[PDB]
Design an enzyme around this catalytic site. Structure first.
Site, PDB file in Angstrom:
ATOM      1  N   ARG A  45       0.834  -1.202   0.000  1.00  0.00           N
ATOM      2  CA  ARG A  45       0.000   0.000   0.000  1.00  0.00           C
ATOM      3  C   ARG A  45       0.876   1.262   0.000  1.00  0.00           C
ATOM      4  NH1 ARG A  45      -3.147   2.663   4.978  1.00  0.00           N
ATOM      5  NH2 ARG A  45      -4.176   4.358   3.802  1.00  0.00           N
ATOM      6  N   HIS A  49       0.850   4.403  -2.638  1.00  0.00           N
ATOM      7  CA  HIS A  49       0.581   5.774  -2.229  1.00  0.00           C
ATOM      8  C   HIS A  49       1.739   6.757  -2.414  1.00  0.00           C
ATOM      9  CE1 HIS A  49      -3.275   5.656   0.272  1.00  0.00           C
ATOM     10  NE2 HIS A  49      -3.278   4.823  -0.732  1.00  0.00           N
ATOM     11  N   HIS A 172      -5.956  -5.748  -4.050  1.00  0.00           N
ATOM     12  CA  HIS A 172      -6.895  -5.699  -2.925  1.00  0.00           C
ATOM     13  C   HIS A 172      -7.341  -7.048  -2.402  1.00  0.00           C
ATOM     14  CE1 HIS A 172      -8.093  -1.230  -2.918  1.00  0.00           C
ATOM     15  NE2 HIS A 172      -7.065  -1.563  -2.180  1.00  0.00           N
ATOM     16  N   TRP A 188     -13.498 -10.350   7.558  1.00  0.00           N
ATOM     17  CA  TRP A 188     -13.647 -10.808   8.932  1.00  0.00           C
ATOM     18  C   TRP A 188     -13.278 -12.268   9.117  1.00  0.00           C
ATOM     19  CZ3 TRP A 188     -17.176  -7.699   6.498  1.00  0.00           C
ATOM     20  CH2 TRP A 188     -17.445  -6.489   7.124  1.00  0.00           C
TER      21      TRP A 188
HETATM   22  C1  HEM Z   1      -9.448   3.297  -6.700  1.00  0.00           C
HETATM   23  C2  HEM Z   1      -8.233   2.760  -6.094  1.00  0.00           C
HETATM   24  C3  HEM Z   1      -7.996   2.515  -4.740  1.00  0.00           C
HETATM   25  C4  HEM Z   1      -8.706   2.900  -3.572  1.00  0.00           C
HETATM   26  C5  HEM Z   1      -9.959   3.771  -3.397  1.00  0.00           C
HETATM   27  C6  HEM Z   1      -8.078   2.220  -2.529  1.00  0.00           C
HETATM   28  C7  HEM Z   1      -8.476   2.261  -1.175  1.00  0.00           C
HETATM   29  C8  HEM Z   1      -8.117   1.401  -0.115  1.00  0.00           C
HETATM   30  C9  HEM Z   1      -8.636   1.454   1.170  1.00  0.00           C
HETATM   31  C10 HEM Z   1      -9.795   2.319   1.656  1.00  0.00           C
HETATM   32  C11 HEM Z   1      -7.887   0.536   1.903  1.00  0.00           C
HETATM   33  C12 HEM Z   1      -7.934   0.293   3.401  1.00  0.00           C
HETATM   34  C13 HEM Z   1      -6.975   1.188   4.203  1.00  0.00           C
HETATM   35  C14 HEM Z   1      -7.062   0.993   5.708  1.00  0.00           C
HETATM   36  O1  HEM Z   1      -8.118   1.218   6.269  1.00  0.00           O
HETATM   37  O2  HEM Z   1      -6.096   0.608   6.374  1.00  0.00           O
HETATM   38  C15 HEM Z   1      -7.019  -0.059   0.997  1.00  0.00           C
HETATM   39  C16 HEM Z   1      -6.003  -0.977   1.326  1.00  0.00           C
HETATM   40  C17 HEM Z   1      -5.023  -1.574   0.517  1.00  0.00           C
HETATM   41  N1  HEM Z   1      -4.856  -1.258  -0.767  1.00  0.00           N
HETATM   42 FE1  HEM Z   1      -6.008   0.090  -1.849  1.00  0.00          FE
HETATM   43  N2  HEM Z   1      -7.092   1.445  -2.987  1.00  0.00           N
HETATM   44  C18 HEM Z   1      -6.978   1.689  -4.297  1.00  0.00           C
HETATM   45  C19 HEM Z   1      -5.984   1.124  -5.104  1.00  0.00           C
HETATM   46  C20 HEM Z   1      -4.964   0.218  -4.757  1.00  0.00           C
HETATM   47  C21 HEM Z   1      -4.006  -0.254  -5.651  1.00  0.00           C
HETATM   48  C22 HEM Z   1      -3.948   0.176  -7.131  1.00  0.00           C
HETATM   49  C23 HEM Z   1      -3.152  -1.048  -4.850  1.00  0.00           C
HETATM   50  C24 HEM Z   1      -1.926  -1.684  -5.109  1.00  0.00           C
HETATM   51  C25 HEM Z   1      -1.177  -1.828  -6.359  1.00  0.00           C
HETATM   52  C26 HEM Z   1      -3.761  -1.125  -3.598  1.00  0.00           C
HETATM   53  C27 HEM Z   1      -3.348  -1.949  -2.534  1.00  0.00           C
HETATM   54  C28 HEM Z   1      -3.850  -2.016  -1.225  1.00  0.00           C
HETATM   55  C29 HEM Z   1      -3.400  -2.889  -0.241  1.00  0.00           C
HETATM   56  C30 HEM Z   1      -2.359  -4.002  -0.435  1.00  0.00           C
HETATM   57  C31 HEM Z   1      -4.145  -2.570   0.901  1.00  0.00           C
HETATM   58  C32 HEM Z   1      -4.103  -3.258   2.252  1.00  0.00           C
HETATM   59  C33 HEM Z   1      -3.474  -2.443   3.379  1.00  0.00           C
HETATM   60  C34 HEM Z   1      -3.391  -3.145   4.740  1.00  0.00           C
HETATM   61  O3  HEM Z   1      -3.583  -4.357   4.837  1.00  0.00           O
HETATM   62  O4  HEM Z   1      -3.123  -2.485   5.742  1.00  0.00           O
HETATM   63  N3  HEM Z   1      -4.797  -0.276  -3.512  1.00  0.00           N
HETATM   64  N4  HEM Z   1      -7.251   0.386  -0.241  1.00  0.00           N
HETATM   65  C1  LIG Z   2     -11.273  -6.049  -0.267  1.00  0.00           C
HETATM   66  C2  LIG Z   2     -10.311  -5.001   0.130  1.00  0.00           C
HETATM   67  N1  LIG Z   2     -10.329  -3.750  -0.280  1.00  0.00           N
HETATM   68  C3  LIG Z   2      -9.319  -3.088   0.245  1.00  0.00           C
HETATM   69  C4  LIG Z   2      -8.603  -3.976   1.026  1.00  0.00           C
HETATM   70  N2  LIG Z   2      -9.241  -5.107   0.911  1.00  0.00           N
HETATM   71  C5  LIG Z   2      -8.779  -6.358   1.589  1.00  0.00           C
END
Ligand code: HEM
Ligand SMILES: Cc1[nH+]ccn1C
Length: 291
Positions: A45, A49, A172, A188
């Site tokens: 993540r 970012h 995701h 969950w």
């Molecule tokens: C429209 C695009 C995207 C949105 C709105 C978005 C939004 C989010 C949100 C809301 C979370 C949860 C954050 C938290 O509460 O800790 C999340 C987590 C994550 N996202 Fe995204 N994301 C986007 C794109 C991406 C992309 C393009 C990647 C990677 C190439 C990615 C990888 C991840 C990963 C691996 C997590 C897990 C973080 C954790 O386990 O703490 N995201 N995303």
């Molecule tokens: C489904 C999902 N969206 C963002 C994170 N994850 C695990």
């Protein structure tokens, strides 16, 4: 605005493979973080970012400057929770003082995908730290409560096409959302830390339910404990998107190959590579090294 890559003086492959192995070795060791998910998902993540701020029109933002170390960016509400990944990387930067901020934040992202057994990602060294006034303003990262039209338009700014956006979003399947970071919650019971095409399979086979969460936000929930953001559910709502989701749910090798190209394009956007520069490095995993 031109950003030319510049290798850290005298460093070659062998040096970056040491920094890779230090991150991987700490990934194996600090395995308890976030109810035994470990640090892999928040490190990919973070790499997304620090690059996701790029703007193709004036070449501001992107991974090159390492501007996340500065207060304005580190305190961006969209980066809530990523302090955890930064503190994970901090003993390693102390140990290799010579690597630039940008190269370390993007190499942590590469290392995490390979160690969670995803595809190899070619990586290129050379990002240079830039001054605090080059820190991009807050608000360049996407909203989660939106549709396919918004995702497609948001990603045009990083010039990612549909096939690149759908491959990128397969990440995701990793990790989880945290109500105090983003106002969303779940999955969950059993969150995932192995890299697979399982998100596309779940999106097409789960029975989904539009519910409202404790932060008063709507999300898609499944009987099995799986969740999805409005922006994630978008991928089966749009006809161009849905046909690529069916392609990846039915071919995990084409998914791995396409992710690797779009993730490397994302970490490299905005950087000019001089033609005498080293070819991209492919790093060995601890498993291929017997470590
Ligand atoms: C429209 C695009 C995207 C949105 C709105 C978005 C939004 C989010 C949100 C809301 C979370 C949860 C954050 C938290 O509460 O800790 C999340 C987590 C994550 N996202 Fe995204 N994301 C986007 C794109 C991406 C992309 C393009 C990647 C990677 C190439 C990615 C990888 C991840 C990963 C691996 C997590 C897990 C973080 C954790 O386990 O703490 N995201 N995303
Ligand atoms: C489904 C999902 N969206 C963002 C994170 N994850 C695990």
């Amino acid at each position: 605005l031109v950003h030319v890559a510049s290798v850290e003086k005298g460093r070659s492959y062998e040096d970056f493979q040491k920094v890779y192995n230090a991150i991987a070795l700490k990934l194996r060791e600090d395995d308890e973080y976030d109810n035994y998910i470990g640090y892999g998902p928040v490190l990919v993540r973070l790499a997304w970012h620090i690059s996701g701020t790029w703007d193709k029109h004036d070449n501001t933002g992107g991974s090159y400057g390492g501007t996340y170390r500065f207060k304005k960016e580190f305190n961006d509400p969209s980066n809530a929770g990523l302090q955890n990944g930064f503190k994970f990387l901090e003993p390693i930067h102390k140990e290799f003082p010579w690597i630039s901020s940008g190269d370390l934040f993007s190499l942590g992202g590469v290392t995490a995908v390979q160690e969670m057994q995803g595809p190899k990602i070619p990586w290129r060294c050379g990002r240079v730290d830039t001054p605090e006034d080059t820190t991009p303003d807050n608000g360049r990262l996407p909203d989660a409560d939106k549709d396919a039209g918004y995702v497609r338009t948001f990603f045009q700014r990083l010039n990612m096409n549909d096939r690149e956006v759908v491959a990128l979003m397969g990440a995701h399947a990793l990790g989880k959302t945290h109500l105090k970071n983003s106002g969303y919650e779940g999955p969950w019971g059993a969150a995932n830390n192995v890299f697979t095409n399982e998100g596309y399979l779940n999106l097409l086979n789960e029975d989904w339910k539009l519910e409202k969460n404790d932060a008063n936000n709507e999300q898609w929930d499944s009987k099995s404990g799986y969740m999805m953001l409005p922006t994630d559910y978008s991928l089966i709502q749009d006809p161009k998107y849905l046909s690529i989701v069916k392609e990846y749910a039915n071919d995990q090798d084409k998914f791995f190959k396409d992710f690797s190209k779009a993730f490397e394009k994302l970490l490299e956007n905005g950087i000019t590579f001089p033609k005498d520069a080293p070819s991209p490095f492919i790093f060995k995993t601890l498993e291929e090294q017997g470590l």
